[PDB]
């Protein structure tokens, strides 16, 4: 029997046991150049910035393959066990501060100033060293499948030919998933800039030549599954801080109906009229940052209230709040400088980010009735395989032929090579956090446990340090 | 909507009406009447925008309208007037004027383009509602609306 | 803008997007029963209860300027004395939107 | 104060990279993560923190560079130089937010009802540790004595 | 035009759950309570 | 059995797809991409459409 | 009940004056104060005190 055509909310075929676990990852550090990958000798230095979505793959310990000391644990063929997140608490350990980014030679001809001298015709170069504060924001989202982002790119132009060399490219929206080293949105529209900046002077040096993603919340709210995100939080403030002008030649100026000519002036306008502002993040606080705050998930926003299908979790956490760069200065000779030279001290540039992950998973048995079993076919192709419900034909009942010393020339060559099977997410890559062992059952022991039981009412430690003032 | 002055400027037009001598006190070697225009308009400033201030993506449950019409789609039609300059940020571009990546940096080689893009979505929770057609109520609509 | 013989709508961040959401007439629909309103007694319509306009784009501030604006001087105390207006005094002007 | 925490003594060989008061001294920070993990909880009964900051200027170091942006990032110009020579480090100056009569966390009795550890305030070893720091109250005091009396 | 992109299954769409949630008939209540 | 919604991976409505305004503008991509939406089967042949 | 309704676009009020009386300001790198000339007035912008 295969009747159903519309999705059923995951609670209906999912039994929730009353068991809890605590999965705490040991603190993670990574350090490196803020802007681009560096290369000393024959080794590298990961370009670790404060504007990249750290995307963790929290791989779980398969539930259905655990220890059952009793007969009460689900019958071997009726039901299957999985994981269900209840609490998540991403901890960010670093000194608070603002993120800055700049570029050696930026493209800014002039700004919003009234007493500044008149605009000199653009010289061969007008670039200058540019400071540009990060557009502060914070994003956290937990789910089953990797989060999806959107961006702008150039869509193939049509056969119709009215083309020129400097003609502007058509644009179009595109989706993608968010991987480990992607770019956060800093003040400019999202796009694989690689095909938009042919000038190399249009972006802050760290962001340039890399793709700026964004959370396609719209898409996430539409998926039946909801696997995209269990829940999520975002806080971001920005505002213009200066106003600048590009320095490129113009292929389209304002017609004479907008621009009124003047004496001894020029018929058409020549200096480009693009006014993009530079965005500076609002002052960051001890209360605004969304972290170290346990998130109790009580109902997801989808038909999937936190079921770790495929014994897998995806944590997409990004914030430029914590990050501040770290400068260094080594003597170019190894001996403290006796005098102050501009050549003696080499300026180095290292920045470092640290996380921690804590989950309060619970055990939950899904029934395996003909109907519910079936149902998952359309919900997901892959999690069925974990169940092993599907049949695999008895073809080991075909007699193939083994040989001894398959090496001997007279004997068969055995040239053919078996190909290793691919993983579901092997093309894309992201931080891989294994939790198969760093999992437990004693809630009281850990930090997030007391924090849990406290709210529960079963507390040896209630979260209250009441302050009156 | 928040705003506030950020600079203060002055127009540059000739004046057909200056402040009379009862306001402007002349000075030595100065001029009898004032000639430079005295218009002081400030430049509008949009203050920092937040993740909480923007009014969107927030379902609006309409329980009672502010008129005698609590949400009736008369004429099977709706009008949504939505405007905000919050989301928008312009997008710059730079194509080489020849089609080949520039080997050297010229002020003439890269053409600056301008492209900005806006995206919406609309969602409604309409309900069915039957209007009676009694001589009295029927009539009534004559003055409420000619067309429906 | 105008390239060739085609156009490019001037899409700004400062324009009231006004949608006409045209509905499906609720009076001409399939009635599989009798309790459905009698044919001549009454007519059905629509009534909105909920609306949720979703805006999908990266947050940020809107800027606008002009090639040659008309601004002679500002509110500064140490700026040199006002030169008689020359033939032109316009300059390139940045001007952030009034959010 | 605005810069990462480190015994700068081995990081600033230039003597021009820190504010004179902080230089040559170690910048610590509260390792909240560690404190929340100790079974005892002896590390902290409770605690409060309030701190605001934001960039106020953006500057550039002045050191010679051992690593510039490759040609794939920096596009050369006419009569320009093959490789970039002026350093490209952009650190912002830390800015302290305006302080209020309400924001400061003091003079406010803290009633401890349940600690965050298995130790709800037991002075083991008849000892207590109070770690209190804030740059809010402080303002320097100038003076001027005549060089002759 | 919305003449066809109109339905009757509240549960299916994003704004539906968001609706039923408030209603009390919920498969998905809008609560991700955060304590701090 | 398909349009009727009896058996399918996801609701047609649930999926979110792009749609532009003024798709003829050179800013935008060409009309050929329009084919991605489910396509009427008898499109090769043609006849009076009432 | 009273309900005063104000119909106009929001914004800030500015006011100035052709020749205001301001010799100098709170600046540290500004040149030294020149003896007051016959006139020191200048065109002055001054935003209202909302």
Curated annotation (Swiss-Prot), chain A:
Main location: virion
A GO MF term: structural molecule activity
Subcellular location: Virion; Host nucleus
InterPro entries in the record: Capsid_L1_Papillomavir (IPR002210), Capsid_L1_sf_Papillomavir (IPR036973), dsDNA_vir_gr_I_capsid (IPR011222)
Disulfide bond listed as a keyword: yes
Keyword Disulfide bond: yes
Pfam families: Late_protein_L1 (PF00500)
GO process terms (BP): endocytosis involved in viral entry into host cell; virion attachment to host cell
Cellular component per GO, a single term: T=7 icosahedral viral capsid
Keywords (A to Z) from UniProt: Capsid protein, Disulfide bond, Host nucleus, Host-virus interaction, Late protein, T=7 icosahedral capsid protein, Viral attachment to host cell, Viral penetration into host cytoplasm, Virion, Virus endocytosis by host, Virus entry into host cell
Protein purpose: Forms an icosahedral capsid with a T=7 symmetry and a 50 nm diameter. The capsid is composed of 72 pentamers linked to each other by disulfide bonds and associated with L2 proteins. Binds to heparan sulfate proteoglycans on cell surface of basal layer keratinocytes to provide initial virion attachment. This binding mediates a conformational change in the virus capsid that facilitates efficient infection. The virion enters the host cell via endocytosis. During virus trafficking, L1 protein dissociates from the viral DNA and the genomic DNA is released to the host nucleus.
Subunit structure: Self-assembles into homopentamers. The capsid has an icosahedral symmetry and consists of 72 capsomers, with each capsomer being a pentamer of L1. Interacts with the minor capsid protein L2; this interaction is necessary for viral genome encapsidation. Interacts with protein E2; this interaction enhances E2-dependent replication and transcription activation.
Assigned protein family: Belongs to the papillomaviridae L1 protein family.
Protein name per Swiss-Prot or TrEMBL: Major capsid protein L1
Curated annotation (Swiss-Prot), chain D:
Role noted for this protein: Forms an icosahedral capsid with a T=7 symmetry and a 50 nm diameter. The capsid is composed of 72 pentamers linked to each other by disulfide bonds and associated with L2 proteins. Binds to heparan sulfate proteoglycans on cell surface of basal layer keratinocytes to provide initial virion attachment. This binding mediates a conformational change in the virus capsid that facilitates efficient infection. The virion enters the host cell via endocytosis. During virus trafficking, L1 protein dissociates from the viral DNA and the genomic DNA is released to the host nucleus.
Name used for this protein in its record: Major capsid protein L1
Subunit record text: Self-assembles into homopentamers. The capsid has an icosahedral symmetry and consists of 72 capsomers, with each capsomer being a pentamer of L1. Interacts with the minor capsid protein L2; this interaction is necessary for viral genome encapsidation. Interacts with protein E2; this interaction enhances E2-dependent replication and transcription activation.
Localisation per UniProt entry: Virion; Host nucleus
Family from the record: Belongs to the papillomaviridae L1 protein family.
